[model samples]
Target: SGFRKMAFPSGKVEGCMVQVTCGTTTLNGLWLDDVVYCPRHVICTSEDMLNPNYEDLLIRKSNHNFLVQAGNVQLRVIGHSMQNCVLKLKVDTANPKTPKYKFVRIQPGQTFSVMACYNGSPSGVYQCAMRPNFTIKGSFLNGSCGSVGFNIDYDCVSFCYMHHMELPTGVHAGTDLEGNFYGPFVDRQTAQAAGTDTTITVNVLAWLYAAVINGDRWFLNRFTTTLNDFNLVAMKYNYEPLTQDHVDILGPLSAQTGIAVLDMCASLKELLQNGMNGRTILGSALLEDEFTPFDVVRQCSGV
Candidate 1:
């Protein structure tokens, strides 16, 4: 069957709902469109800078997949409708075999995550773009971060780290790789040591996503993607104290902005330092006294 012709097989999962309560209070507004609309009263309504209510409309089972063209990676269609539509990652155009990495069904007008990391490659972008539909509210990995409703599509993936590693550049299997095992990192120890800082990983992840959304895949494509553009729009960024994109991405003060490269660099270094202390706080929550790399291992480069 044609992909679009497929319907979201009907069956309720853990979280499922029909009515979408989105957009702030505005006039009688555009007649609730096709989705199950739940209007808000004037007293409770508010406006968001990044949110455009019309874009937040729930994507039915129709819009199945997003076309992503970056390096050796292509998107694997997982969900068909907002109800059951799922998205997965692939290396090159091949089907995903490694324990398929995925996020769950995120409903409209609810809360969910756009993952983040510090790998300097797809790890940054891949994690940031997987937001749920019709978001009056959304969040990143950390609790301190959040944004209001606006439609966002996960069309690409990205990650960031220092300019040292090869995987971020699509060299997953060492130098002359074809598809599956393309890079193995020339110096795994160095890469791991340098990336021990989570803040750097998080900001880099944000940067790659923003870059791809802005069509800035210049280096990532030459390194990892066979295609030039990785169909992405909008990105999550850190709360830059300086209120500048540079401080939001590279960190500390950032050299790119020229306003204070050393200051940004030093600031990023401090955040990395804090990531270590943050890990210590995270250590207390233990079941069997075991935590997956998901806890502290820093997983952003692959899936």
Candidate 2:
């Protein structure tokens, strides 16, 4: 017996499902449509003939990858060539007679990053070209001399620092606990520092699940300690205080906390000279080992 048909295999097909829940509340849910549905069986005869007119040669195209990454305004270009080569990148300018020294040369298998402002509008139109060498003309090189057209918005760093600092507007506004908007600052602080996000939720749930439902306290005190810290921060932000039900409903407060805290400090800086004393309370608190989540819970528990 001889075979008359040859079938090519197709790429793998897959399906996925996701569920997000915090305590008894369902954050997100998807139904049965999450999985791929496909035919289970197909019939084919061996009498079919192969197509001889199909192309067999693979043509490799020259291309480069560019990512407008976050952090600061910068251009990230990567040369994907196997062999090492020098490439030149030039930003378009209004003057054709501008000096060529502004263009930089890049090496293969390496990344080149530089600060640049690109706005994605006609007013901010920017054109750039990359080539293998100085000798080759762009028109004749085609793909080898890659010409990129882009217009992008400038990235502005608005990093808000709010660890241990009092909010710009609050009961503690412009007091010794008050801090400057940009003086002796702390770096990026998350809800974990303030103790109000998932870390608190998971720990609280874990403890309750073991102690209340399963009749175990082995992990209760440790997680309760975390819950106590969360409760202090929650109370500071005027949340529902210490109840687990309230904490679960409050969800993530990192963004809100940061914004509220920053706004509070900003208000203090504007309205009061007491803001001067407020500038260093968080820093001082950190130094004395007395104002972290651990301390917040410990003091609240009166232990």
Candidate 3:
């Protein structure tokens, strides 16, 4: 072939060379950066460790898309194709020690799309690619390119569930023997609805009693000084509290249940002597820990 002026597209350039190779003759293609002018005007070629065609296949935001959705730690990639062809992706290029891959057959007019994720929650920047040899004629450009990166935010399956299910911010039913929150459930409605369970209600009351003995100020503030107040609160909510006979009905329950029974008696005696208010109160005692039951009751009653 003879020398001629060859026109190449202008963009970010890498080491691209124009060449004519015969068995014994070697010709070097010349260029200014990535721009090449072949005196021999033969076909020019370029190579890169990563796909050399990435610039053409992935140029502009219009061609490639990536996203990480849900705690499942899945990455979704959607690509626009100018032609119909099959494409493959190599996943987790950020950690190639153990990599995964996916193949998708894309129709000519529609887009190509695929999802990459793990069984559990994961965290990393995952990379996927379509090698140069992959068909490009009318696809992502005229041919195949390399990679695009997506990131996973969480790292464990359980962690993802806990976050998505909203467990950390969930509500609990009263306090326990040690004055710690107990009976964690989805929300206030779920916890209150459980009050219909006789066994569960009894256990919750026992734990509340234990909180009283343990000097849980929040529990005391919410429940009135007398069993009358406690019973009234339960009644208004359409549930039952321990009556005298029920107090003695603990044959197989925890010792704390028996203790709760005893404490109820003591509480009633003190309320009778002190003439304490035994009205049903609303709102969480936890809302303001510094306010005691008496403080709140007196404030609400205007006494």
Candidate 4:
């Protein structure tokens, strides 16, 4: 009779006949101890990164969700083990009759955006990670960008516009608000109908997700998040050139980084002067939508 040995769920396969083949190779060393070991199915063989509490065992190079964090605005969040999970902008209306905002599921590299402006919001932290588990658990907010609102836990909601007008008394309300109702404007073309001119200023912004948001200030917290996760899917960014962090959340560029204050345009032009240009300068580098403005002064106060 021939003899054979194997392993079972909750069984020990040490020094036994059970074997595990990950991809194109058979794992025989260390008896494949640190991986998903078996004579059947897949495995997780990381140096100590993969969670032992994981319900799945997809490899590092192939898994869709790995090392996912909770609060970066545009960063890839934890996949719900089964499911963008895009966060919808919050509608912070005093009117109870306002409609609720909806959310959508992201496919691979698709995006779900929420706006954070440069209006100097008092709060810097916000909850951005949607559905988290395992690798994405225990994460929290850590960045700042004026005022923003999105997802179910939305904050600082607005269109980032200022309307300067002279209206009838007792007709306006709320923060930075002059009025929402038209009050039956006398004419469509001119405020002369109401006896005054209406001036409106809408802000022009680079998507916080699109621009790399560097240190909050005093070099305290550097919240740099990118639009796409090139580490997971390479095809999406294959046609695009990649770069790393800069652009402050509170301001376009910081006064601390003299390059920004001295000549912002030249720095920007050189950043994209040629078809194949690399800033050539290297550096090292999230979450509360409320950015902590401390790093800028930490060095310069004494510099």
Q: Give the candidates in order of lDDT, highest first.
A: 3, 1, 4, 2
Candidate 4 at 280: error in angstroms? 8.4
How far out, in Å, is residue 41 in model 1? 23
Computed on alpha carbons, the lDDT of every model, listed in order, comes to: 0.21, 0.20, 0.25, 0.21
* TM-score: model 1 vs. ground truth: 0.17
- For each predicted model, how many residue pairs clash, with residues at least 3 apart or on different chains? 52, 10, 4, 24
lDDT of 2 at 167: 26
For residues 16-105, what per-residue lDDT tens digits would candidate 3 score against the true structure?
112212122223221222221211101113322123233354333241232212222332323322111111211221221211222122
TM-score of each candidate structure, all chains considered together: 0.17, 0.14, 0.21, 0.17
Candidate 4 per-residue lDDT over residues 221-290, each given as its tens digit? 2222233432122222222212232224324324334333213322222222232232221121211111
Instruction: Please give the TM-score that candidate 4 achieves against the real structure.
Output: 0.17
Error of 2 at 263 (Å): 34
RMSD of each: 23.3, 28.2, 27.0, 26.4
For model 4, where is the 10-residue window of minimal lDDT? 198-207
- Write one digit per residue (lDDT tens) for candidate 2, span 31-129: 112111110000001121122111120012122222211123222222211111111111121212212112123211111111111121111111111
* Ten-residue region with minimum lDDT total, candidate 2: 36-45
